[PDB]
Amino acid sequence: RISADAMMQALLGARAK
Amino acid sequence: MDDIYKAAVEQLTEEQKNEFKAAFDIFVLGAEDGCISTKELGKVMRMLGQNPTPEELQEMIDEVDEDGSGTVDFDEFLVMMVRCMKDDS
């Protein structure tokens, strides 16, 4: 039941600023 | 052979891939190549709203650890995703 979407969270900028 | 997966891996488009590849930059965001471990796992999970332990995490690698490597390369990883999604239990 790997929602997957949850990952997008860990890959949302990852402190790019 | 693992062909049943090939097709599946072929189904995925650059789209689902990207979003995925991204997560690939977190699991092995501190690995030499692209092998994931129980230490790295918790790293991602924590960023996914989950905070597991190193005892229950190992169970994540174990499965993918078919070669007894101790970690999760870039192969077994994606597979483990298609194993449940297209065959969960």
Ligand SMILES: CC(C)COC[C@H](CN(Cc1ccccc1)c1ccccc1)N1CCCC1
């Ligand atoms: C389905 C959930 C209850 C837990 O599943 C997460 C991991 C898969 N991940 C990748 C992943 C992590 C977080 C969010 C989405 C996907 C995994 C991959 C390689 C090594 C360890 C874990 N496996 C354990 C059971 C089968 C799948």
Ligand SMILES: [Ca+2]
């Ligand atoms: Ca392995």
